[PDB]
Structures are given as structure tokens and as C-alpha cells.
Amino acid sequence: SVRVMQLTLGNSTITTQEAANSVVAYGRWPEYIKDSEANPVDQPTEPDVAACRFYTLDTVTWRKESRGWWWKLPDALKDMGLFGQNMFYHYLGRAGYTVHVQCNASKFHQGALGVFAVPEMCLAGDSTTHMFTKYENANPGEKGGEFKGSFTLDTNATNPARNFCPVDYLFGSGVLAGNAFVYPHQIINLRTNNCATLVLPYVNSLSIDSMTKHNNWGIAILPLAPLDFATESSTEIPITLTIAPMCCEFNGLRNITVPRTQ
Amino acid sequence: SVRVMQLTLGNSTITTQEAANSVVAYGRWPEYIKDSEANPVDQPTEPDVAACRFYTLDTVTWRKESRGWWWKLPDALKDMGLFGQNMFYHYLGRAGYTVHVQCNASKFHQGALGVFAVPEMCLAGDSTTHMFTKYENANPGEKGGEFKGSFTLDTNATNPARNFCPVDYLFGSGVLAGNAFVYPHQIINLRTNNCATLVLPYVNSLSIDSMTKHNNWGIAILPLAPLDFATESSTEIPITLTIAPMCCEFNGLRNITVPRTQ
Amino acid sequence: GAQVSSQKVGAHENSNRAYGGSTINYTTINYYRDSASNAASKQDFAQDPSKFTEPIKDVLIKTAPTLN
Amino acid sequence: GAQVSSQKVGAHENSNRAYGGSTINYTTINYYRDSASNAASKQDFAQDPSKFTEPIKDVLIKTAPTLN
Amino acid sequence: ANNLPDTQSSGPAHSKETPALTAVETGATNPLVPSDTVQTRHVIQKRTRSESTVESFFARGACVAIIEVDNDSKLFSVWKITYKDTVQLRRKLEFFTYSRFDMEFTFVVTSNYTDANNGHALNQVYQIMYIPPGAPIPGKWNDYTWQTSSNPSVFYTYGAPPARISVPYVGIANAYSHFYDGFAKVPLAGQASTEGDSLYGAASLNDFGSLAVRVVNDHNPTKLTSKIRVYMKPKHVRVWCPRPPRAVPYYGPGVDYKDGLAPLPGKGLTTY
Amino acid sequence: ANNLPDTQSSGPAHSKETPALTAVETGATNPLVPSDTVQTRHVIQKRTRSESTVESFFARGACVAIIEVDNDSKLFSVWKITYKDTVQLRRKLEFFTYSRFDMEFTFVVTSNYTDANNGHALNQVYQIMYIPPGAPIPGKWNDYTWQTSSNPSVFYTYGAPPARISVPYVGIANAYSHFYDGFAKVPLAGQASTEGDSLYGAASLNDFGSLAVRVVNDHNPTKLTSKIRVYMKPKHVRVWCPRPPRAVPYYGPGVDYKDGLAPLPGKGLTTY
């Protein structure tokens, strides 16, 4: 039925008994580069089962006060097994994804989470200096980031944070959040479903790019209807994020990249 | 399924996700007068969409102590939009109906309502004078009336009430209520359904009659199993009644009728 | 090398020329070798919004229950 | 996409060209896609004034008595 | 750019099909039409979406720059090519993530005497030279760079109809990116913080080069100023991935915001 | 736009057919021709009604507005689009109740020095921007609204032949109404008199929007004034329901009158 599914990729399987169908972004399933759209001339590496499998990133907790969370792809998976290895050993890389967000509660809980997949999800910074966010802050990895309820300008001139300041109702980029529904999405309304499943093809203005310099997709999760339970002002339910890269192919092998951190 | 439905008449739509099928009284769907059964010779008016649509009468509240409610048709709809206008402008009128009773609660509530559609639903009065109920009392309109737990004789000779005294177990007419199941009906048992839907054809010993002098159908709602909740001696759930006239045709147009009231 | 297309006549004159003939056609000829120099033809097509309106994996009917 | 119509010659020159040939025709070609950009053809038709002059239900003959 | 479907007449219903009920959690929009929830009549639809096609939406010349030159270094000016110096065209382009089109540039040139009662000059001729990223940039209004042996130049005579030229799709990618979630450099472990640092959301330091404008006539002591307003129109348009439009004021070339963060007015929940 | 019928010869009569007698009470006009009441000869008719066709009657550019701008807020002006600012075209249009046509607008621009012996300015360029009802109206001769990324603009260089553009049938109804016997609002029972009140015979508060005109050049202290005379010609014309023409002077946008109520002169009943 629309509600029961099983996803198998490599050596990993995911089962769900409360789905609300699955979304295939823009109606496009991920695919490899065709010869007619090929650019780099060298033989690509395609790890296949070693990289195209389900990786579970860290679990976040939803509370009445949560504003939202965000992650960047392939960034969030840079340290994930052999996918991360191939990402750092190659100059160029390409991949699609199957994003599976998990969140179960009970029949006496309420709340709705909007799960959006955004191509080129550029976020707003914290200073008066334009495009000032530094690489280390823009790429948090598997832990991702969070949305805020208001904009707060960083004034420390001696030691600028050079970080993002994504305000939730402004979708972290100066647009109204209610219009974010034009992007592939699903809603995890506690009275209806457990999860959200989105299949994302590779989207870019090029056939292949640098995975370290460029993040193709952004995953934004916003509480559309806040978490509430029985009478417990105190309520916490975890949100686990499991993502699997698809049709990975890398070009331009050399020595490994070791990016600067923190 | 037997449980999900959508009813559309004119500019009004009703949806339900917890139905228990629908009853079509005597297996007859409402229809217009055929030439072989026609009586008045003048061209009829058939308002169609302007009169044949869903009209929501006033909501009543069910409590542990409720004895029951009753309404008369077309009486309850006499002030409803263009249906009421056509009713009063014409000497003769005919119509069928789609009665949709609404009552939702929760999985921890109990109670069962018997919804009966009675042709020629004559009720008992309050005095020793036979057939003494006056027109104004017999025709309450959209607010309808209520059943009582016992018969109480009106003794005020100076100012007789000239009203009905419908005792519930006597079905308000001197017959046992348990036998009222011989009339088209449905039961709204809180653990099973939200509503009751009955399609009533025009029933009478004539093809067309005076809608102001005569009520063709009566709607009786009796608590078969009283309302009860968790441990709240205090419980109230509303019962909304939505009715839509069908195949309306009127004959004998003249000046408007303005009946005496109160 | 002339391209002859027909116009979508809005307001019609009290003429038969307003309803037929070359009088409701327009002529075009490209003078430049580079396609960039060309004007816009404006005979543009449409498409199905489904990729945005219903990017669902398992296709569903509006009459039928969405959650099944 | 050229439209070739003939002119209604008023004053005639002492030529045979004033009475025949392409010399009494004029040529037209639309350059714009929108019909609004077009000039007026001016080959406009007429109609019966009856809707104004005789909007009578029961048609009457002038020779015959109007009031009958 | 076509027709809309006709409305078919629809009568009453009493069925198990309920198109009015749905579940938006799936991520889909309910494709209902009037006849699904009310009784409709047959209407022969004659309206079309001819003017809302991606092409017609952009088929307008929008101002992207106002270059100024004072013919008394101001004897010449340089404008770094961009569509972000103005807000109107920028906001329309940003309804999409990627685009691919040709461009038509029209130049409206105006000039005037600064002094109401002083100076005089003969008719001016302007040279608008395109300097592709890499070509030498003029240091003086009359140095060797203005020979344009390879750079495309446009010589405009004051008073003539606005100059106009077409440019093909010149991107180095398969489409123009309106948004680039990345950097041009990756800072490597071990290098000084000064190292490997670049702007967020920036690609090349010099994407499309710039325009160098000057008056070719010998300057007279007279005080004169000229302004070249650049209008650009995307033609032969294709766009990908729609995005919600900009709701708050722009704050630079990025998606940064600062000032008008409260765009919506107050309105009663139960007030019509 | 065609031929007239020939006159057929007609001889004497002595019959029971009397076309001369009629009864105008019916609401009809007696369709007599000369041969009905007199003896006629055969005349081959060569006259036609080519110039009185609805199209030829309106095929002339009529002045509908004179917009003025002083290049020393007058640096720019706004004209609410209408055909009622002038009387000549208005009176011709009002021979009919409804109309449907395309429009051709020609702009004649003139300018001059206010001072006979002072000031000087270089050739002016004008921008005529159409602001459709809803679009932002310019507050300054140089604010962001003049970027016209979507509004249609016309840039005219002084001295060039008059500018000219065509506009399609833009009505929201199936025809333009020259007369509207109604209101835009219905006052409801119970509401304050201030409520539900609107002008008699008025439809939208902003029917067709307006034109914003300005000189693009930087203004010099010199005193200059320009005037843009707007000429409009209905082309591809269709008209419905004839009405008697305006006999007394116009008094506003409505059918109101006040002054020249006695249009006819005196003449003796028996004076030729």
C-alpha cells in the first residue's frame, strides 16, 4: 500500500509501516553520465555497493522549542565509509541520493515536520560583509546546522564568526518559508506518517563537479506545527536521518584531499 | 468503501470518513411527477440547484440526560434560502430529501443514536382535548422539538399550551419505540460511525400537496444507548443536521404565504 | 528563406481579410548567421506541471484514497 | 506572405496601365506577429439597416397598409 | 503558451469517490477542478496562457546599469558586467536556479552641460569596448587598449537611435547558475588561514569581464557629463528549478539580508 | 463600404397600393425611394459609401492628451489614461454604446527654452513608461520604477519622427463600454453612509492605468519645458448600439450638463 515499503541498497535495508508514498524530485531518478553529456575524458570509478548504501547520520531531538535543522549534500556524507574516501581521492564526483527521514511518536502526540530538498541551498550569513561565511562553517558535515527564530548580526570585528544566520520564516535565505513547497518535499505529520522519503537525481549546471567545493542539495527540516503531547510541556522525540548515495562516479584521481577544519 | 463517501448537490459537498453505508427509504430514489401521475395542469417550477442543495439546520447537543429530538419536513426547511421562497409562493409543492446527521466523538466515548425517517409522523398532544395541538406548535421550523421521559397533561384551562407531549418509549405516538425500526433508519453508534445518511423519496397518498398544511416526513433521533465518557459525568457532543431537498417542483403560483407564528 | 506564420487575430475589422488570407499571416526572414541575432519566434510550447505538482513515486487517482 | 489587392482607380492617366495590370494593384506584407500591429485593410463590408429602420415583429410591405 | 480545458457540465454525486479528501503529506498537490466539488455547466474555454510563457515573462528590456563618464580619470569608466546592480530583473531571474538564453543589449545615451550658461561642444561619439576577462584594461581614456583589434567595440554617435547588439549563450557551464552553494577554493589542512579562503557562493573572480566606456572626442574645458543606461533582454529562454521569490530587501550579491525582515502587514484572522 | 442601387424608371400610377401613407407608431421608418412618389428615369448609380464605413469614420489620429514636463517634482509627469480629456474623439465614440478595436498611439514631442537669452542644453531623450493598474508609480524622476523590467517603455530622442506603438483590445469585458448605467458597489442595509458609496457610471477606479513621462538627461539649471501630445487612432473597429450625439457641452466624465443647454437658434416657422 502507500504506507508499507522496503528499500534495499547494497547491504542495507529500510522498512516502514507508515509511509505517505515517496517523492522522486522533479520526476527524475538518479542516473550515470551519458557519453553525449560526458566531459572529463578519463575512466570513472563507480564504487557501486561500497558507496551506494544507507548511511545513518546523527539523530537530532525535536522539542516544543525547536526551530529547524539543515544539512548539505555531499557534505553530510563526507566521512561516511568508502563514499567519503572516493569523494576525497577524486577531483570530480557525482551522485544522487535516497533521503529517508525517520520520526515516530504515538497517537496522542501532534506536530508536523516539513522536509524539503533544495538545489543550490544558499544560506544567509551573520555579518555586514557579503558572502563572508567561511568554508569550515558552511560545511558542518553530518551534524549539519539549525534554523533560528531571528536575525542576529555578528559585531565582533576582532574575531568575526563568519557563520550563517538562517532565520526560519525567511527560509534562511530571504524568501518566505511558506513558498518552500515549490521544492521537492514531504510532510511528517505525526497523526499520519513515520517518515519522509525523497529520491534526488543529480542536479547542477554541469554533468560533474567538485564535491568538496560545491554542495548540490540542501535538506531543510522545519516544524510546521510544533511538537505537543498529552500535557507534558516536556516532550522530546528523536529525528533520525538516513541517506544513501546513488550512481556514484568519480573522475580525476590523485592524492587525497584533507580539508582544513573548525 | 462502505465508510468513505462524498455527496455533492448544487454548490454544496459533504465528505465523511466514517459512514455505515446509506439508506434509500423503501428502495425509492426521489423523482419528479410523471405525466401519467400528474394532477395540477399548470407548468411547474423546478428551482433545481437553487433549492436542491445542502442546508445546515441548528446544531443540538447530546448529554447523558437527553431524551431525543424530532423535526418535520418540509417544515424544518421553510426558512432555507430559495427553497423556502418557492414553498411559500406556491400553493402546491413536492420534494424528496437527503438527510445527513453528523456526530463525531472519540474512541473513549460510547452511545448510540437511532435516526428514523417516519412518513406521516403524527405526534401526541398534551390535553384531554383531541387533536388540540395548534399549527404554530406543530411546526417549530429548523429548531424542531424534543422527546420527553413521561406524559404530563396540560391542565391550564384558561391558557392551554396546545402543544405536543411526545413520550420517548412510546415513540411520541402510543406505539413502542423498539418497533420504530420498521421505518427507514440508521444507527450512529459512536464506536462505529460519524453519521447516518438517508435518501427519502416523496411519500404521500397524492402526487403533490400543500407544503404549508402538510408535513410528509418526520425525523426522530433517540439515544438508544446514552452518552458516556471516560469518567466525565459532564460530557456534551453536538449533533448537526444537514438536509438537502431533491427534485423540487411547485405548482399554483400566487402571492406569498405568510403564516401566523408563535 | 522566408518563414510565413499566421497571427492570432484579437480584434476583427469588418473585413473578410480579418478572417482569412495572407492578411492574417506575417512574414519573417533571418538576416544574420548567428542564431543569437535572431528575434524570439514566440511560438512557445507548454508542458505537464506534474514534475512539480505530483512528484510522487506511486501514482494516485484524485477520486481514490491518497493514503492507502 | 504577400497580399495583393486591387485599387479602385479614381482619376485615370492616359495609359492602359491606368485600366489594367499590376499597375492598378497594391501589395501588402505583415511584419509583426501581433494582429494589433497590422494596418487597417479597409476592405470593409456593409449590412442591412433593418435592425434599426424596421425592428418590427410582423414584417410589412410599403405598398400595403401598415395598420391592418 | 496554449489553451485551457473546457469546463464540462457536472451533476450531483453520492459515491465512494471522494476527490475533496486528500493527504498533502505525500508532497503532491490535489488536481481538483470545479466540477469535482460543485455542479458545473459546460463552458467552452477560450482563454490561453500565451503571455505567461517563460519567454514572454522575460521579453522586456530591463535596466541593469547606468555608466557615467565626465568629459570634464573620469574621461572613461569601467563597469564590471552583472545583473545584480539593479533589483527588478534580478528578482525575476531568481524565480529559477539555472537559465540558458541569448542576450540583447540596448544602450540609451544621454548627455548635458553642467553649466546653464557656460561652455560648448560639438556632437560626441562614444566607444563601448567589451573587455573579456584577461584582456588589458584601459589606464587612460586614450591608451593603446582602445585600438580594439580583437575586443568587440560599439561606436555610438550622440542623438542616433539607441545602440543594440546580441550576445550568444557565453557560459562555461551548460547553464547559468543563479545560485552556487559553494566556494572557488577548498582550504587545505595545514595552510595559513589567509590561504584557501574565498567568498561563499562565488565562482570566478571575473565571470564575464567588463565594459569600458569613453567619449572619443578631444575633451574641451567645458563641463559635461554623459550617462549610458544599459538595458538587457533575455531571448531564446530556458529555465530550470523554480524557487520562491525574494521577500525581503537584497543585501549584496548574495542571499544575505539585514533590513526589511518583516515584509507582511497585520490583518485580523477573522477580518475579511 | 459599397455601391448604392440604381434608380429604375417609374411611370404614372393609379392603384390601391399607397406607399406614401404609413404609420410611424409601429416604430419603423418608411423605406421609400423616389420612384414611389414621382416618375423617375433610369440612373446608373456610381456613388458608394466607402468613406462612411465605421472604420473610415474613425481612421484619424485624434489628440487625447498634452502631457507637460519641466526639465526645470515636475522633472516627470503622470497622465491617467482616458479619451475624455478632449472632446472631439470622445463625441465620435459616443455615437455608440459599445466598441471593440485596437489602438495606435503616436506621440508628437515639442520643447523650447523658456528664456530667450539664457541657458543651453544637449538633445533630450524622453521615456514614456506605461504603468498598468497595480504597478508601482514613480515618486521621483529617477527612482527604481524607471528600470521598466516588465512595464513597456518608449524612449524617444528629440527631433526624431513621432514615436508610435500599437495596443491590442485590452478590455476585461468583451467590448469597451462608452456608457455604464451602474455602480462599482452596492450599499448594503445597515452599513454607514460612508460605506458602499461609489460614483455613478464608474467601473474600476483605475481602468487602464497611466503614463509616466520624464526626460532621461540630467537636468541643467536652464529653464526648459516639453510637451508630449498623445494621438490615438482606433483600428480594426466594431461598434454596437447607436445613440444620439452630444448636443450640449460636456461637463465632466459623465453625461452631466450645466452650461450650454440652449443649443438651437431661433428661426421662423414659415421662414425658408
Ligand SMILES: COc1ccc(OCc2ccc(COc3c(Cl)cccc3Cl)cc2)c(Cl)c1
Ligand atoms: C543569468 O543572467 C546573466 C548571465 C550573464 C550576463 O552577462 C554575460 C555577458 C557576457 C558578455 C557580455 C559582453 O557583451 C557585450 C559585447 Cl560582446 C560587446 C559590446 C557590449 C556588450 Cl554588453 C555581456 C554579458 C548577464 Cl547581464 C545576466
Ligand SMILES: COc1ccc(OCc2ccc(COc3c(Cl)cccc3Cl)cc2)c(Cl)c1
Ligand atoms: C473606448 O475607448 C477607449 C478605450 C480604451 C482606451 O485606453 C486603453 C489603453 C490601455 C493601455 C494603454 C497603454 O498603451 C501604451 C503602452 Cl502598452 C506603452 C506605451 C504607451 C502607451 Cl499609450 C493605452 C490605452 C482609450 Cl484611450 C479609449
